Amino acid sequence: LGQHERKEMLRFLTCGNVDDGKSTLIGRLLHDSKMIGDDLALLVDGLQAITIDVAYRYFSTAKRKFIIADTPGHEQYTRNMATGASTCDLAIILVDARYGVQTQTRRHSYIASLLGIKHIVVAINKMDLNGFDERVFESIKADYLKFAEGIAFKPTTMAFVPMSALKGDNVVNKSERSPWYAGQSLMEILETVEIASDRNYTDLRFPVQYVNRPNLNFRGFAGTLASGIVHKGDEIVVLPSGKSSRVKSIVTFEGELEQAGPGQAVTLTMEDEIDISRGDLLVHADNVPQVSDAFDAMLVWMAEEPMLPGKKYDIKRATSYVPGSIASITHRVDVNTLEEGPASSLQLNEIGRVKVSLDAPIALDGYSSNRTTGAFIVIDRLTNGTVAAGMIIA
Amino acid sequence: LVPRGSHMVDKLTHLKQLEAESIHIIREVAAEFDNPVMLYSIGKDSAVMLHLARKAFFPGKLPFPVMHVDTRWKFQEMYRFRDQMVEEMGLDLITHINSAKHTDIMKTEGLKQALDKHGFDAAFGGARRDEEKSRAKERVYSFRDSKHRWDPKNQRPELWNVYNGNVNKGESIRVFPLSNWTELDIWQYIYLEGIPIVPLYFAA
Ligand SMILES: Nc1ncnc2c1ncn2[C@@H]1O[C@H](COP(=O)(O)OP(=O)(O)OP(O)(O)=S)[C@@H](O)[C@H]1O
Ligand SMILES: Nc1nc2c(ncn2[C@@H]2O[C@H](COP(=O)(O)OP(=O)(O)O)[C@@H](O)[C@H]2O)c(=O)[nH]1
Ligand SMILES: [Mg+2]
Ligand code: NA
Known part of the structure; x- marks a missing residue:
């Protein structure tokens, strides 16, 4: 009461695979935000208990309002993560301390970066298991940074937090188990990150x-x-x-x-x-801005039916609705390896650079310049379904 | 020339941001659908949605009618509140009438029958995602077929604030403007806006 009237809204995405500890992490966040008694147990239980579905979770502090976009980490749910990533301001890339950066770490990072997430926090979880070994933390941070360097992945903030979702270390309050850690806890980041990213x-x-x-x-x-x-x-x-x-x-x-x-x-x-x-x-x-009927774009294909160059689709940009087609596929990005490859088709969950052609010209911006006027959806003219997420390159 | 800075405009608080996002959704449906309706209860969430609908179209009136699926009887203070609400806003309110059995025949079938009688292709519901656990995977647009049922493959991924309303002849949708709002958001909005509310303070 009183102070809860002027808060910001931060939407953040959670990324990781089975057993990384995200049900424990989310449960810990939803719970410890209420403690201004293991009820936590039942919260984590509920969360542990083919679809386009994204799970949207809600909680708040006195500082700001939070929407958690939860999606499974398996390749099959790339479109799901893409859908979730589109409105998010920040991504929590969750890694297991024993395994470090994996293919799913690389894949989730790309998707977040592709969808214009300007803030990532690498949540290096299960640090309680290694005895809060600084060497392990520094190892994982360095080789994630090496990966980030080879994408031109330059978000406005990149943080590395050593934590234990299970034990609470560096999740809400700073941990005494890591004196070598000078950074802020999760939540401290989540509350303080400037969202003048628009x-x-x-x-x-x-x-x-x-x-x-x-x-x-x-x-x-x-x-x-x-x-x-x-x-x-x-x-x-x-x-x-x-x-x-x-x-x-x-x-x-x-x-x-x-x-x-x-x-x-x-x-x-x-x-x-x-x-x-x-x-x-x-x-x-x-x-x-430039006004044209032809442009390059990244496409996240999300239909069971494959994409065929030459086939007429409907392009809904924001409020701009113009029929057209993809003239050619420049390349398809392998989501696991992050390299270019020639293609004449796009399958479900596939991403590629495409050449777009419209029946009439629209005003346009690169998605990296503008999150609205550089974003569009591809619509099937016969099925009415939303088949692909597009973002203009200019 | 130097561009304008953020220090010039008052930054978006959570309720203002939610307000704008819900207004945008309402406008889209109005822009794309022929016969929308605002399903208005007599309760607190529908009061916030109706307030949003007004903000969405000022200085115009609602381009769509408002509906109330009437059961046998609700609280007496609700009827009196809603009756005065129609006269005090020059509103177009449609009433319809034809808790296991009761709710099924009166609400579920009543609403179903009301949509068919008028030929509505879009319906505004004030349901929130935090109200029930299942609602977490819910979308803003909920696509229904001719015979009115819900099908998984007919549902569409909702990407930014770009929404796909392309629908077939005889097909209708359910729209949830308030899906991002929480219980706290609503009351906080009711308090700051001074939205009139039924004297009973327990969820209707
Ligand atoms: N009988 C009805 N007539 C018209 N619309 C309804 C009816 N029941 C529910 N709705 C719509 O569906 C949503 C679900 O209703 P509720 O979850 O009970 O919320 P509410 O009635 O607006 O607020 P409450 O009951 O005081 S918590 C509401 O926002 C209404 O807009
Ligand atoms: N020791 C330790 N165990 C953890 C940590 N985070 C999660 N776990 C455990 O790992 C198991 C799976 O965690 P869970 O949250 O369900 O992983 P999920 O599949 O990503 O949801 C559970 O037994 C958790 O208690 C951590 O930081 N440290
Ligand atoms: Mg009610
Ligand atoms: Na309600």
Whole structure:
């Protein structure tokens, strides 16, 4: 009460294989966040007790709100981890202290990095078993960093925590079992990591979602700010066509705002009767992204049915909906080994660089520049299913 | 020219972020579906959802009607609250009427029958993922077929805040705007927004 009114929201992903200790870890987190008595036991039990499913877990502190995205670590559930990773701010890459970096460690890291997770914490678990051997910790940290170096995997924060999910060491409170550890505990990271990772305060992207026309004289353009800051009187342009207008008003239920930032559900009114439909992007006139009908992209294929170049699909970017096809597959990335390989097909759970072609041009951004306007889904025209997750390279 | 910084706008708190995310979902459905309905209980979660729906369309009214699946009888203070709510907001409320047996015939079948009579293809439910254990693997969009059943392969992965609403003729969905909210989030939202609530303070 009182302090719980102004908190942030952090979504984080949990990555690891059978018996790494993630049911124990999650159970420990969900439990010790409530202790401001082994009930923990029943929590861990419940969590231990072919699907597209992602498990979403909820808990909070006084500092912030947490959503845990839980997904199994087996290759077969890559699409599942991809789905979960898409909204996450941070990933907990969980390793067993005796085994160190494995193929699943490499695979989960790639998926997290691919889906734009800017914060990873390597949770080196079961350190209680090796007697909190610093040598083991340093060994695992170094060869994970060596792996990270060979991906250009440069997230904004990378932390290595020696812990015991079972015993609680460095999970919530710092451990006396590791005097050689100067870093912060998990939870201390989870509460303090800056989530100004939505870097896009610099470039306005407003995907037009809904044309609100209540009466004949109010014409509003509703949606969510993907990036940048819009200000009353800003000179904007739509990116379908290139034509310009000035922002008359920023309209919300609370009233009229002078400015609005990323992640805000607003409605924009315009000074000129400019023609704006759902699917168009509204942008700053002095800062305009490329507009094209062809682009490179990473694809996470997630349908049982294979992907065939030339076959018509529907591309839903954000609010931009345009039919098209993949012209060619540049390569398919083997998720286990992280190397390029030629292909003429993409199977279930497969990832590759593709050449995309659309029937009409959209405004575009590299997914690494913009998490919204660089992200898209591939939709089958006959089955209506969401068959692939796409992220633009530019 | 130097770009604008975050120090200019008030940073998104958890409730504001949840608010925006739920507004976005409501707008998408409205944007893609012909005949949506907001399934409105007379309870606390549906009150938050209805408040979100208003925020989603200001200064317009709801482009969709609101529905209440009426049983034999609920608390007397609920009927009186909801009746006044319709008159005080110029709302379009549809009532429908035709705990093991009771709930099955009146709610489950009633709601099923209500959707068919009007021809709705999308339905807003205020259910939350933290309310029951199973809800953890639930998605925002829940795809139902013509005869109304749920099929696993017809369900679609929900990637960012991009949602796939492509549906066939006679097929309908269930939308859960509040799925990311917790019990604490809702009350905290009710308190800060001053959302009117039924005098009884125990989950209806
Ligand atoms: N009889 C009904 N008529 C219309 N919508 C309903 C009905 N029952 C449930 N719903 C919808 O389905 C969701 C599930 O209901 P509940 O879990 O009981 O939440 P609530 O009734 O809004 O709040 P409570 O009961 O005070 S915790 C609600 O958000 C309603 O929008
Ligand atoms: N000694 C030790 N045991 C652990 C640790 N974490 C988990 N375990 C044990 O490993 C077993 C499997 O853990 P679990 O959380 O179910 O792994 P999961 O399959 O990833 O969910 C259980 O008996 C746990 O008690 C740890 O840090 N140290
Ligand atoms: Mg109720
Ligand atoms: Na409820």
